[PDB]
Write a protein that binds this ligand. Sequence first.
Ligand code: NYJ
Ligand code: ZN
Length: 208
Amino acid sequence: GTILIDLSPDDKEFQSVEEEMQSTVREHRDGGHAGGIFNRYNILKIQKVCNKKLWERYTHRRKEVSEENHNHANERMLFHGSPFVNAIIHKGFDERHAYIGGMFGAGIYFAENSSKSNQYVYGIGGGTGCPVHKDRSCYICHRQLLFCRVTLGKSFLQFSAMAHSPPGHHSVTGRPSVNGLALAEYVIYRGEQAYPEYLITYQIMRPE
Ligand SMILES: Cc1cccc2c(=O)[nH]c(-c3ccccc3)c(C)c12
Ligand SMILES: [Zn+2]
């Protein structure tokens, strides 16, 4: 039941999504090992993801969370990079997308930094890079990220140098305490707390 609608580069919705993507690139502690070396992206396409069932699932859950957190869903737009992007847009998020080895436990992880999500499009640590060239820094192969609507509710705050939510919390916020320039990462424990709203197709660009 999923359909993808292409946005025109002239549409302001295209433009505000491209801006979120480009403005949240940062340097990573691995020097680009996992996601490559770039300062910006070539955006090739942005598609709106429409699925009634998955949307209704998301909003039913968002209401429940809101009612348990002084009528505040604490909804964000966040990036998700995954080798399973094709499964997610058709079937939604679920426990198969849980990162068992994650620093904040076995949940589904989202980033404010697009370049953080970009590290995972070929799997943990960047796997072995693109299918065609086995290159984690490939400038040629087309990559995909999701920009998702994520309900955080009451988020447990964890400073930093499918499992359950910490009791009484709806999500976890991993806030980098050492790198002042890294933005936050978030973890949810219920697949129904995220909706994959935009599918963004892109290349990383070789710095000049
Ligand atoms: C740890 C983390 C922080 C911030 C963002 C992400 C992300 O976007 N994707 C993933 C991830 C998803 C599927 C398989 C492997 C990693 C992960 C793990 C992730
Ligand atoms: Zn390649």
